[PDB]
Amino acid sequence: LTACPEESPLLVGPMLIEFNIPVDLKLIEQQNPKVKLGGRYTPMDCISPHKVAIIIPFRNRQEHLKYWLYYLHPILQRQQLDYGIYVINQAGESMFNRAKLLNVGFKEALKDYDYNCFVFSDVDLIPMNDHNTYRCFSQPRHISVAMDKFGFSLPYVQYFGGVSALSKQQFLSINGFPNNYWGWGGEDDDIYNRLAFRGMSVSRPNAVIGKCRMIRHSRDKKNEPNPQRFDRIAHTKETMLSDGLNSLTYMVLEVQRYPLYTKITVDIGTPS
Questions:
Q1: Residue 98 counted as an annotated binding residue
Q2: Where does Mn(2+) bind?
Q3: Using CA atoms, how far apart are residues 235 and 73, in angstroms rounded to an integer?
């Protein structure tokens, strides 16, 4: 049992990513035979140093998930990662809380395995080049750098939304993510502010390797509106230590181990 190489030899580079072809999960299971129950895979040919837990905040986007699973299982294996898929499903109908579900995912995933790396990904973003590794780096990593929906250009240098990865230590260091933004906007910039304060920076792949497509119904070129950073910097400084991993409260309603992913349905609350 040798350690896995620097970069994996299985890499293909640029890939074609499109959604004309609807997909069936049964087909994906058969196309990804080495994927054990619950969305787990561990390379046979070597030992991976990256035990990655991929967390997806979710609610009623089954179609998107199908396309996500279709493209990401093959890629993640070519990257030679020891990984698990976690779909944190918000039970409920109260406004969505992306950051809190990601926290729930961190905590729940550690109950299954000694993960040392966490990738936080929206269900609707697919990387276009398997050189954009879904793993941890020496500094917090922003993976979805150039998204087709934003013209393939980072909206602003401190944009940390979409897909990012943090080592277990990096994550603990900032007290996790905020639980109080709900769907008001800005959790991603608060998270960036947390990084700044605990003296870290943002690691990124080059812009061509960091290309990503958004799962867009049929064909829409129409570049989306540019998001502008929310100025909540004073606010992050005061609330970082009290809103986060240490104040995280929720109730796991149900846990299902599907062939391709683990689905944890939780009740996380309502805004107050």
A1: yes
A2: 124, 217
A3: 38
